[PDB]
């Protein structure tokens, strides 16, 4: 038992992290096969850059890629959206089985924070409904990646590009498309107002039941439609029938109907917690997906 | 910016995890050089075991060690306190630079949860003042290890042995000595009443200041002695002058005197938070050490 903010083991991604240097700028890159992926803003000095221009003025030799202690020779460079791809002469022998995936808001992933191509730490986060992530990133972290692992396949879903003025974080999928409306320019950009991920909050309530916190349960039930009326009021995402279906296995294992759990959340939203806690939290946690809960509570 | 429950990258430990099988029991082992370390209760079937007896009745062939897909041949076995050491014919080529350390309560470490010798997830935790840890562990997790990484040296500090009836967790250092009063027997054992780690709470308050949460600061100061009187009342560990000194660099970087921050904690203990949060928490977090904060906030 127990329930922790748990990341995937990071080894398979550690073996892919490199340092990419272009002029005075250093940041991190992802070395898979004979290709190195990094934020294209590594070629900037960029209040309003034209990256087609900045890249036409570069040659392979303007890029220094360092893997461990060995320099890798760049033998070609290109742009795919907001990611720079650097072809190298040597194919990373530690390349895992992998895929690139573009995740939906509300999905979670592990982040391997890296500096100068050296991994620093690993943590879990979620793609917020407003397409930011609440990460932990210092200067030099751009190019650090987010990922999930399934069996032995690393699904890369995030590459870090920018910290916004609010201290939240924005980046791309590994094909270089930003999550959300953001662009890689040093210009005024605000995220939409964020909302709480309802289906995850419910999954975490089921995790709490699986671990013996029950003080919030009740005999009541609600209709999907009546619950959503409360959710909107408290800036929660609407719950869909597909969410209800995805919560199926947990509802079964705990014998608690999804719409029964929705009645608990209603009370907690209305009456707060009154000084008690759930899985060691004094507020409602929304960065565990239903599949995260099942993974960690029952393997 | 941002502040997360951050673990060390787990790759160097992943390359050491094996499966150890003795009879009907399977659990995890740590393969370093030509030696495999695992809980000695792998040889039990143990309401009151005599491990000297149970081990004299075993031969090398009673132990199956599986690393990846290859079986490793056991060429010798011994007991050191509560850890079984299995000498193997082949020295793990992925052995990192490493040391065994016995940590003090209040120190944090990363945990690599493993099942059948396969890493499952990584998370941070702390050694509680009562020498338990609040981990996340399912059946089969025994032998999973906790560790810190310094430069490139893995300091192993924990091996998982038991879940207590309260759902908290007990284990040993890597030389097999339990933290706390626990013994590896299926018998009534309760942990001491736990307390909150004051110096860590203060470190986390400094992290919050470094990230722009300041609503809890005040103009007041307190004496070390007066603060401890409040701490005792709220089941906080006494703060020592050595704690004050360890908080030195943070106090400086933020320009906030340790004893000034102690005045804030007093208020928060007395008046609670009144519906506001700190680093995304509605309660006082005590599983970040002063060195964790410095690592993550300023590298
Ligand atoms: C729209 O919102 C405002 C932010 O505008 C941008 C836009 C663009 Cl194109 C990029 C950036 C940005 C750049 C660099 C950088 C700069 C020079 C050398 C190395 C690095 C690294 N590495 C670093 N960071 C950063 C800092 C701390 C945490 N995370 C990310 C950044 O955000 C910020
Ligand atoms: C004093 O407190 C009560 C617990 O008494 C003990 C004492 C002793 Cl010697 C051991 C245990 C114990 C054993 C086994 C086990 C048993 C058989 C086969 C494989 C495994 C694994 N692996 C598993 N676990 C466990 C379960 C879930 C989370 N963490 C640990 C355990 O605690 C529990």
Swiss-Prot record, chains A, B:
Q: Active-site positions, per UniProt?
A: 41 (for 3cl-pro activity), 142 (nucleophile)
Q: What is the effect of changing residue 129 to H?
A: In strain: Omicron/BA.1, Omicron/BA.2, Omicron/BA.2.12.1, Omicron/BA.2.75, Omicron/BA.4, Omicron/BA.5, Omicron/BQ.1.1, Omicron/XBB.1.5, Omicron/EG.5.1
Q: What is the effect of changing residue 142 to A?
A: Complete loss of 3C-like proteinase nsp5 cleavage
* Activity regulation description: Inhibited by pyridone-containing alpha-ketoamides compounds 13a and 13b. In turn, alpha-ketoamide 13b (tert-butyl (1-((S)-1-(((S)-4-(benzylamino)-3,4-dioxo-1-((S)-2-oxopyrrolidin-3-yl)butan-2-yl)amino)-3-cyclopropyl-1-oxopropan-2-yl)-2-oxo-1,2-dihydropyridin-3-yl)carbamate) inhibits SARS-CoV-2 replication in human lung cells. Inhibited ex vivo by michael acceptor inhibitor N3. Inhibited ex vivo by compound 11a and 11b.
Q: Where in the cell is it found?
A: Host cytoplasm; Host Golgi apparatus; Host nucleus
Q: Where is this cross-link: Glycyl lysine isopeptide (Lys-Gly) (interchain with G-Cter in ubiquitin)?
A: 5, 87
Q: Which reaction does it catalyse?
A: TSAVLQ-|-SGFRK-NH2 and SGVTFQ-|-GKFKK the two peptides corresponding to the two self-cleavage sites of the SARS 3C-like proteinase are the two most reactive peptide substrates. The enzyme exhibits a strong preference for substrates containing Gln at P1 position and Leu at P2 position
Q: Where is the Peptidase C30 domain?
A: 1-299
Impact reported for residue 46 to A = Does not affect ability to cleave and inactivate human TRMT1
Q: Which residues lie on this side of the membrane: Cytoplasmic?
A: 1-299
**What's the stated role of this polypeptide?**
Cleaves the C-terminus of replicase polyprotein at 11 sites. Recognizes substrates containing the core sequence [ILMVF]-Q-|-[SGACN]. Cleaves and inactivates human TRMT1, preventing tRNA guanine(26)-dimethylation of tRNAs. May cleave human NLRP1 in lung epithelial cells, thereby activating the NLRP1 inflammasome pathway. May cleave human GSDMD, triggering alternative GSDME-mediated epithelial cell death upon activation of the NLRP1 inflammasome, which may enhance the release interleukins 1B, 6, 16 and 18. Also able to bind an ADP-ribose-1''-phosphate (ADRP).
What subunit structure does UniProt give? 3CL-PRO exists as monomer and homodimer. Only the homodimer shows catalytic activity. Interacts with host FBXO22; this interaction promotes the proteasomal degradation of nsp5.
Q: Which protein is depicted?
A: 3C-like proteinase nsp5
Annotated source species:
Severe acute respiratory syndrome coronavirus 2
The coding gene here is: rep
């Amino acid at each position: 038992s127990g329930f922790r903010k748990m990341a995937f083991p990071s080894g398979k991604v550690e073996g892919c992290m490199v340092q990419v240097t272009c002029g005075t700028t250093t940041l991190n890159g992802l070395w898979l096969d004979d290709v190195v992926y990094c934020p294209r803003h590594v070629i900037c000095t960029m209040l309003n850059p034209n990256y087609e221009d900045l890249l036409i003025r570069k040659s392979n030799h303007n890029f220094l890629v360092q893997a461990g202690n060995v320099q890798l020779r760049v033998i070609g460079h290109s742009m795919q959206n907001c990611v720079l791809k650097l072809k190298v002469d040597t194919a990373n022998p530690k390349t895992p089985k992998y895929k690139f995936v573009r995740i939906q808001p509300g999905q979670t992933f592990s982040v391997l924070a890296c500096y100068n191509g050296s991994p620093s730490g690993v943590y879990q986060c979620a793609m917020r409904p407003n397409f930011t992530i609440k990460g932990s990133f210092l200067n030099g972290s751009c190019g650090s990646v987010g990922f999930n692992i399934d069996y032995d396949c690393v699904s890369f879903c995030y590459m870090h590009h920018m910290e916004l003025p609010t201290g939240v974080h924005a980046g791309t999928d590994l094909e270089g498309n930003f999550y959300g409306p953001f662009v890689d320019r040093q210009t005024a950009q605000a995220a939409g107002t964020d909302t709480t991920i309802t289906v995850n909050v419910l999954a975490w309530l089921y995790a709490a039941v699986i671990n013996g916190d029950r003080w919030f349960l009740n005999r009541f039930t609600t209709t999907l439609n009546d619950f959503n009326l409360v959710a909107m009021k408290y800036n929660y995402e609407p719950l869909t029938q597909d969410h209800v279906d995805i919560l199926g296995p947990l509802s079964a294992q705990t014998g608690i109907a999804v719409l029964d759990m929705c009645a608990s959340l209603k009370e907690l939203l209305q009456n707060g917690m009154n000084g008690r806690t759930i899985l060691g939290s004094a507020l409602l946690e929304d960065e565990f997906t239903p599949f995260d809960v099942v993974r960690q509570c029952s393997g």
